[PDB]
Enzyme design. Structure first.
Site, mmCIF file in Angstrom:
data_model
loop_
_atom_site.group_PDB
_atom_site.id
_atom_site.type_symbol
_atom_site.label_atom_id
_atom_site.label_comp_id
_atom_site.label_asym_id
_atom_site.label_seq_id
_atom_site.Cartn_x
_atom_site.Cartn_y
_atom_site.Cartn_z
ATOM 1 C CG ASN A 100 -48.923 48.429 74.336
ATOM 2 O OD1 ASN A 100 -49.762 47.734 74.704
ATOM 3 N ND2 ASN A 100 -47.568 48.318 74.271
ATOM 4 C CE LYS A 133 -46.159 49.984 77.353
ATOM 5 N NZ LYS A 133 -44.908 50.281 77.762
ATOM 6 C CG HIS A 190 -43.791 46.068 73.137
ATOM 7 N ND1 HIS A 190 -43.211 46.470 74.454
ATOM 8 C CD2 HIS A 190 -44.227 47.427 72.694
ATOM 9 C CE1 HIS A 190 -43.380 47.553 74.691
ATOM 10 N NE2 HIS A 190 -44.198 48.520 73.765
ATOM 11 C CD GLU A 226 -43.265 46.725 77.805
ATOM 12 O OE1 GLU A 226 -44.435 46.328 77.703
ATOM 13 O OE2 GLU A 226 -43.233 47.943 78.206
ATOM 14 C CD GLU A 269 -42.766 51.182 71.008
ATOM 15 O OE1 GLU A 269 -42.807 50.351 71.369
ATOM 16 O OE2 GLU A 269 -43.673 51.995 71.154
ATOM 17 N N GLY A 329 -41.692 54.272 78.607
ATOM 18 C CA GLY A 329 -41.682 54.351 79.925
ATOM 19 C C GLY A 329 -40.964 55.129 80.792
ATOM 20 C CB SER A 351 -41.485 58.941 76.721
ATOM 21 O OG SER A 351 -40.952 58.074 77.797
#
Length: 248
Positions: free
Chosen positions: A9, A11, A93, A95, A165, A171, A211
């Protein structure tokens, strides 16, 4: 275990020059085992990656989509992606759930539509740090999964990949331990087995993300219910090659 997936990904990152260099790295890495690699560039980079990526183990995914074309300025629809040759999508996701208003019912609707349109879907689920500390992890991830499941038929699960996740791992450098991840993957697989079907559960890929790097990937993959990875930061680097190879 079912066929693993190693998914990149990217991003909202990349330039044409950096992508050309990284795709070359991926092309020159010979993968000898059965794994599906996925790269998810930004929308504007999809054509570039389609033109340059040649490694036969890879497919291209979008990072999001909406279900239908029409008067949705700024968005990209599933029919548009299909027409350009993209038939994988990441949906839900963290985000997008956090910043862009994607509730469980929005994610579930997108997943359902993607499946109807023939996509392979990587559907993302996961708990926040506050939920984890409140001992709500299982309730949260099962709620997110059952919201998706409510809109799907049993057959559609052949197209679904779940990506667990934990939000606190995305991150941040604070990867889940193999035991933490395995506990959730096992709970998810058991829920699928009981609520959808044991045949579905046995073939379902449940990926871990948050991560992952080339050094921790192999000890995550050793766990019985982890089927690969959704990788953010480390997928922009050449060590994604070693993440792929950790799924042997």
């Amino acid at each position: 275990k079912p066929q693993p997936i190693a998914a990149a990904n990217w991003k909202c990152n990349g330039t044409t020059a950096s992508i050309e260099k990284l795709v070359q790295v991926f092309n020159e890495h010979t993968i000898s085992h059965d794994v599906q690699c996925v790269v998810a560039p930004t929308f504007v980079h999809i054509p570039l990656v389609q033109a340059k990526l040649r490694n036969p183990k890879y497919v291209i995914s979008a990072q999001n989509a909406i279900a239908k074309s029409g008067a949705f300025t700024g968005e990209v629809s599933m029919p548009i992606l299909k027409d350009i040759g993209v038939h994988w999508v990441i949906l839900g996701h963290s985000e997008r759930r956090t910043y862009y208003g994607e509730t469980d019912e929005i994610v579930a609707q997108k997943v359902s539509e993607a499946c109807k349109q023939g996509f392979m879907v990587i559907a993302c689920i996961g708990e926040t740090l506050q939920q984890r500390e409140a001992n709500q992890t299982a309730k949260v991830v099962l709620s997110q999964t059952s919201a998706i499941a409510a809109k799907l038929t049993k057959d559609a699960w052949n197209q679904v990949v779940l990506a667990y996740e934990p939000v606190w791992a995305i991150g941040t450098g604070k990867v889940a331990t193999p035991e933490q991840a395995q506990e959730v993957h096992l709970l998810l697989r058991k829920w699928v087995s009981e609520n959808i079907g044991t045949d579905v559960a046995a073939k379902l890929r449940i990926l871990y993300g948050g991560s992952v790097n080339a050094a921790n990937a192999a000890t995550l993959y050793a766990k019985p219910d982890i089927n690969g990875f959704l990788v953010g930061g480390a997928s922009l680097k050449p060590e994604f090659r070693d993440i792929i190879d950790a799924t042997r």
